[PDB]
Enzyme design. Sequence first.
Site, PDB file in Angstrom:
ATOM      1  N   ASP A  39      90.344  93.314 -70.135  1.00 59.49           N
ATOM      2  CA  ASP A  39      90.251  92.244 -69.351  1.00 59.49           C
ATOM      3  C   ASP A  39      89.050  90.811 -69.700  1.00 59.49           C
ATOM      4  O   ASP A  39      88.405  90.611 -71.067  1.00 59.49           O
ATOM      5  CB  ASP A  39      89.671  93.149 -68.131  1.00 59.49           C
ATOM      6  CG  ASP A  39      90.024  92.703 -67.073  1.00 59.49           C
ATOM      7  OD1 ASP A  39      89.268  91.157 -66.200  1.00 59.49           O
ATOM      8  OD2 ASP A  39      90.417  93.379 -66.020  1.00 59.49           O
ATOM      9  N   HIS A  69      86.176  89.559 -62.936  1.00 57.29           N
ATOM     10  CA  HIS A  69      87.168  91.018 -63.026  1.00 57.29           C
ATOM     11  C   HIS A  69      87.523  91.741 -63.755  1.00 57.29           C
ATOM     12  O   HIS A  69      87.762  93.182 -63.123  1.00 57.29           O
ATOM     13  CB  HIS A  69      88.609  89.522 -63.327  1.00 57.29           C
ATOM     14  CG  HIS A  69      89.676  90.265 -63.161  1.00 57.29           C
ATOM     15  ND1 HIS A  69      90.038  91.414 -63.663  1.00 57.29           N
ATOM     16  CD2 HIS A  69      91.067  89.882 -61.961  1.00 57.29           C
ATOM     17  CE1 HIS A  69      91.410  91.705 -63.830  1.00 57.29           C
ATOM     18  NE2 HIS A  69      91.882  90.351 -62.430  1.00 57.29           N
ATOM     19  N   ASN A 161     100.971  89.767 -58.938  1.00 54.23           N
ATOM     20  CA  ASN A 161     100.948  89.553 -57.858  1.00 54.23           C
ATOM     21  C   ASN A 161     101.908  88.350 -57.527  1.00 54.23           C
ATOM     22  O   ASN A 161     101.881  87.424 -56.782  1.00 54.23           O
ATOM     23  CB  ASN A 161      99.442  89.347 -58.051  1.00 54.23           C
ATOM     24  CG  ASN A 161      98.570  90.096 -58.520  1.00 54.23           C
ATOM     25  OD1 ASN A 161      99.037  90.962 -58.102  1.00 54.23           O
ATOM     26  ND2 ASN A 161      98.417  89.171 -58.667  1.00 54.23           N
ATOM     27  N   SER A 224      95.395  94.711 -60.031  1.00 51.95           N
ATOM     28  CA  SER A 224      94.627  94.422 -60.898  1.00 51.95           C
ATOM     29  C   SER A 224      93.742  95.233 -60.051  1.00 51.95           C
ATOM     30  O   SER A 224      92.828  95.645 -61.485  1.00 51.95           O
ATOM     31  CB  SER A 224      94.111  93.184 -61.305  1.00 51.95           C
ATOM     32  OG  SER A 224      94.689  92.178 -62.096  1.00 51.95           O
TER      33      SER A 224
END
Length: 279
Positions: A39, A69, A161, A224
Amino acid sequence: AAQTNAPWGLARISSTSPGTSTYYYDESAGQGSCVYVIDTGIEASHPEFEGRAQMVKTYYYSSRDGNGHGTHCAGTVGSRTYGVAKKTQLFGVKVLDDNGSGQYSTIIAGMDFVASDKNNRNCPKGVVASLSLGGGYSSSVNSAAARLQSSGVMVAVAAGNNNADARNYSPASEPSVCTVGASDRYDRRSSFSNYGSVLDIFGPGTDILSTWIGGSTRSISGTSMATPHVAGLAAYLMTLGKTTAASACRYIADTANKGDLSNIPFGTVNLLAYNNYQA
């Protein structure tokens, strides 16, 4: 063990019903397992990680999470308050820059890095990788995720998404990894969650409280956020000896809460990650 006033998603993964707020889990808590969070990095100094997080690789000028994130996802895997597997070891691999973006070639390099790097780590109960990232369909990205899984790592990836079929996204569309959709606190499919035949499981993804950079916390939404619930669950179940990296996705599907989610399109599994912990 019981954690009172837990984030709804933690309570959900140990419950046969929505609408409760206590997380129940075996005290082994993923001890002896490892989870790679591939990430934007992890703020390892966050008190919520208790020294159990470290950065192991970056492709950029710093290993620091300048975004948040990756820190949020790592917190859902394994932070003391916000995490599923509260005693796992967390390894950060920074393939995404501080704007949250990354070239596919760097993402692929990071996956091959994990497949080798696990041989430099102590993970007697097994190894998981959590990939809260993705883009358009790429056979090379899918193949890298397949290799990582083949190498003995439980790979969990975000479905995406786009409120669309995940067949057109990578690594979501790779058959051999665990593709994770998102649900909300009312057991509805999250409004943004991708779907389709390639999904293996759903996890909590709407309004998920976790760690953030600057030693902070915040609640955000996405597939996520669902992915690290499943990655942490895999690590927890592997520590318990109930499954292995090769079969953890199928085991989680076998033992999931079934048929409880709403607005799941025809042809997508109706399965919600569940630890089946009996106190």
